[PDB]
């Protein structure tokens, strides 16, 4: 069976403008494992992004974590862009500053 990824974007600590933080994008519950994840800064794919090791849960679904060090501002917008075989076009989830 194929499973579409669940996407969650959040910060390491509650966002405080000018204060260093981490933007995380956790993809999980998907199958097969071939997945491509991008962190976006105002539409611009961010480079120098880290990721945990591909792993999977009891139900055999896979989960991967993507994260980058970063300092937010008021003009800055962040999101996570995910594409998987179960998805027609890339899906984009915006980073809600409250998360």
């Amino acid at each position: 069976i194929q499973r579409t990824p669940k996407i969650q974007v959040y910060s390491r600590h509650p966002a405080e403008n000018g204060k260093s933080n981490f933007l995380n994008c956790y993809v999980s519950g998907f199958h097969p494992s071939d997945i491509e994840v991008d962190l976006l800064k105002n539409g611009e794919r961010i480079e120098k992004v880290e990721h945990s090791d591909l792993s999977f849960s009891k139900d055999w679904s896979f989960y991967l974590l993507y994260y980058t060090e970063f300092t937010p501002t008021e003009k800055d917008e962040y999101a996570c862009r995910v594409n998987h075989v179960t998805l027609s076009q890339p899906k984009i989830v915006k980073w809600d500053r409250d998360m």
Binding site: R3, Q8, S33, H51, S61, D98
Partner: protein
């Protein structure tokens, strides 16, 4: 309080393209300590206490143990694939194996095979055989069952070799593995004319198991009043969690967040 050690294997076949993919991981008490690639074929460490050079006595057999499993996994992958009459197709095979030691040293082991993301074969040590989770797994089950020696060796690994490796790991692990760091608890909010959304976050904590709940007037709220917590990882080996509560503006003060974690001496209660 019991302890665990389990390995995770994953790999994929290629559409008529020979060879496959592969990668293994080792966890002790749900803490990832070892990574293994096939592309690089190198055994990397994932924690400070279990390093390549740092106490490299174990890193030797552990690096052997995985290369061995790699071969076995490959053989198994081919066996399972060929027993489905699968070739020009692309498939995946995942394995999970490990042991669970109790406070009393009594061990419980397991070995499970997942094919194309679904349960397929599961080792049943007690009966020295395998459970086929679906019809198409029986041919393989029958193959592995032709000579009990395979089951015997397999069980021997799960009941002897594995626990011994767990003990040895729990050794160079003391001080870091059992180390628990409590969460920083913060209650943020998002206010609007119609409703205020309270958010309670538990940050940079470990181990992952935690307890978070809302209190109305210093008293517990029926669990069915707020979705259960959400637990997420940070890349650094710590975790965070959060719960949400929608309340009428003004009433914020009547709600407090209560968080419990072994790292905390007693339940921690935070105001909005």
């Amino acid at each position: 309080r019991s302890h665990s050690l389990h390995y995770l294997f994953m790999g994929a076949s290629e559409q008529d393209l020979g060879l496959s993919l592969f990668e293994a991981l080792g966890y002790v008490d749900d803490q990832l300590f070892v990574f293994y690639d096939h592309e690089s074929r190198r055994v990397e460490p994932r924690t400070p206490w279990v390093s390549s050079r740092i106490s490299s006595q174990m890193w030797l057999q552990l690096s052997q143990s995985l290369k061995g499993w790699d071969h076995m996994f490959t053989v198994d992958f081919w066996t399972i694939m060929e027993n489905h009459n699968h070739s020009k197709e692309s498939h995946t095979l995942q394995v999970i194996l490990g042991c669970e030691m109790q406070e009393d040293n009594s061990t419980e082991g397991y070995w499970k095979y997942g094919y194309d993301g679904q349960d397929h074969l599961e080792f049943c040590p007690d009966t020295l055989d395998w459970r086929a989770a679906e019809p198409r797994a029986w041919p393989t089950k029958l193959e592995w069952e032709r000579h009990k020696i395979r089951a015997r060796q397999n069980r021997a690994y799960l009941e002897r070799d594995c626990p011994a490796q767990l003990q040895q790991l729990l050794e160079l692990g003391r001080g870091v593995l059992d180390q628990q760091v409590p969460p920083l608890v913060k209650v943020t909010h998002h206010v609007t004319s119609s409703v205020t959304t309270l958010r309670c976050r538990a940050l940079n904590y470990y181990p992952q198991n935690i307890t978070m709940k809302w209190l109305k007037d210093k008293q517990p709220m029926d669990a069915k009043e707020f979705e259960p917590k959400d637990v997420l990882p940070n890349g650094d080996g710590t975790y965070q969690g959060w719960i949400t509560l929608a309340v009428p503006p003004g009433e914020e003060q009547r709600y407090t967040c209560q968080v419990e974690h072994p790292g905390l001496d007693q339940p921690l209660i935070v105001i909005w």
